[PDB]
Amino acid sequence: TASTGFAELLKDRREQVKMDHAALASLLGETPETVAAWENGEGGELTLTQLGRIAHVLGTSIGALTPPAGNDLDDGVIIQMPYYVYNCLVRTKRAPSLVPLVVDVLTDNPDDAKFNSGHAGNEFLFVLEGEIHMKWGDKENPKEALLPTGASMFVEEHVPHAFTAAKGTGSAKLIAVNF
Amino acid sequence: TASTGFAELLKDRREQVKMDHAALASLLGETPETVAAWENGEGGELTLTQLGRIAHVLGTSIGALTPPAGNDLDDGVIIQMPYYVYNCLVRTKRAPSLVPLVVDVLTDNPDDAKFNSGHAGNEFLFVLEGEIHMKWGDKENPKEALLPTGASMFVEEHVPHAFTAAKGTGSAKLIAVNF
Amino acid sequence: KTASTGFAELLKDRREQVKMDHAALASLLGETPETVAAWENGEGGELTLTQLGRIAHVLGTSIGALTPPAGNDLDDGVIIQMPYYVYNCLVRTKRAPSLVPLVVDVLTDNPDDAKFNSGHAGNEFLFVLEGEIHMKWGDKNPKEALLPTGASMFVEEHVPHAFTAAKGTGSAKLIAVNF
């Protein structure tokens, strides 16, 4: 469907900027038959660089000329049967930014907490097991919190944060839902 | 800050549609001094109905004339210490649609599952304890799934769904994150 | 669809979303549960801006999220308007509130008097209808350009700008579409 989606979106955009096959073809150094072919679903072998040139001439992005991620749901639902190890939970092309994980935190030395520099999106966390020592903000003088099982947290986009199990408690587990 | 936010947004919108105090005042049956007062932060006693008239004359919504929810974060973070009972987890005015809950499911009779007709937003779920009998789609001939502890699910906006503990297992627990 | 009726429906949606019953919400607002139920029955019209801000606050959201969209002033999808600076306001619509089109008669031809607009929320398209325009933008050390009749321009959000007719040319006219 990449080729098919591109074929449809290419035609819509070309029409939108009032170009006929010949007009777009000239700008790209192609023949109008070649542009007609792309709109007939034959664009599959176009390279990333060529797509960039086409988007440029059409004053838009490759993204605007390609289809959305797709649908992997079953009547609207998708299920997943069951120092840091990441256990990936269910994801879906219908909500690409959703990345939920069960994180096993195996280090219990807060001095050795390493900061993720911040995310582009928000994050919700729940302490599944053990006790977590969370740190955030400025790596040099961070905000901190000892979080027992059952505690929950929200971390806003771009806020640096790190986690370790509470000093000498061995290990802990968190569910992290980035969205 | 409702009054202060309104004062600033009102002035910006009025200016945007090229109205001076007198022009807006006439349309509302008010004096220009009264409109000037609102822009000086004195709009706190305006009623919901009056706000609706002001938004109408300015061709916009009450929402466009009022401030965003606000910031309740501490350097970008907010934490919460620890047939259906809802245990509300952390929420934040910085991401209003985020509503995470620990749901105790106390009914284990799938025949008695009642369908939530669907949400405006998406939902992620994780089976915390026990085994869940999930149903979704058409209440009369639903899709179903038996989900053991550790299973995860995603439910798209407006998809009806219901949950019960697996037949005769007593009770179960889920973390539901609506966003 | 009154302001009261829209609030009534959105208030109920949000209250249920955060799993509060009438009594729980009433306890946070200095009201009885019966009064909260009344609001949900369309009786919130007299609520003040200040009170609406508190309601939004305890529900962890904004007044905007609890009030209806601007409205629909269209006739099956369309709306038609018959026919130093004078602004002739063209058609506007509650279905696209940021759209503010204007025919601007520029009656000063002394660039030295161009007064800068601090920038807009939103983009802007301009088209010179008559005369010659002396345009200025950026840092009020501004960039400058002479725009003859038929010239068109795009100014991105927040870019400050100002204009007059070209020196000693008398007057000019342009159409400015903010969107």
Next chain:
Amino acid sequence: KTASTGFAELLKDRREQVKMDHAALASLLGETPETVAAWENGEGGELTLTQLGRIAHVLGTSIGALTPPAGNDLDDGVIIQMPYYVYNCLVRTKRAPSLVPLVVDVLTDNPDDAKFNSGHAGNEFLFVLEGEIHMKWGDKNPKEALLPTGASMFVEEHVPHAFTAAKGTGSAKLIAVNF
């Protein structure tokens, strides 16, 4: 900022977001991990549309999410263009791709020949510059209106529309701004 360079950065962001290393991602694409690392070093320019669709698929997202925005063709926030139907394309910008302004010369004055546009993704503002326009919209049982010089109109997304000059009036001219 090449298409290759943008893809390189976004691919790496996404791969890390779903916690896959080079080897894990390589195993889903029929490539070696060294080749995946090369793409992240800017060497993906020859990747085909088909291959990009597969990459997006295994990463649970869209080609759009893995490719750069349209780009910036502005000069400190602005871009300027000097000066049956003939379309004179006015200024456009990659910073607002949906903006397509045009001066349309309408050379047919027989309403019977108005050919309907199935509707647009996006809104549209129109202003009659010369002559009289016979506008049609909705169900190609259409609504109709005569628009004299100076009239303005707004047509919402997806509403089909068509126009000619008013019967026997020769020709007309309008400016159409799609945004």
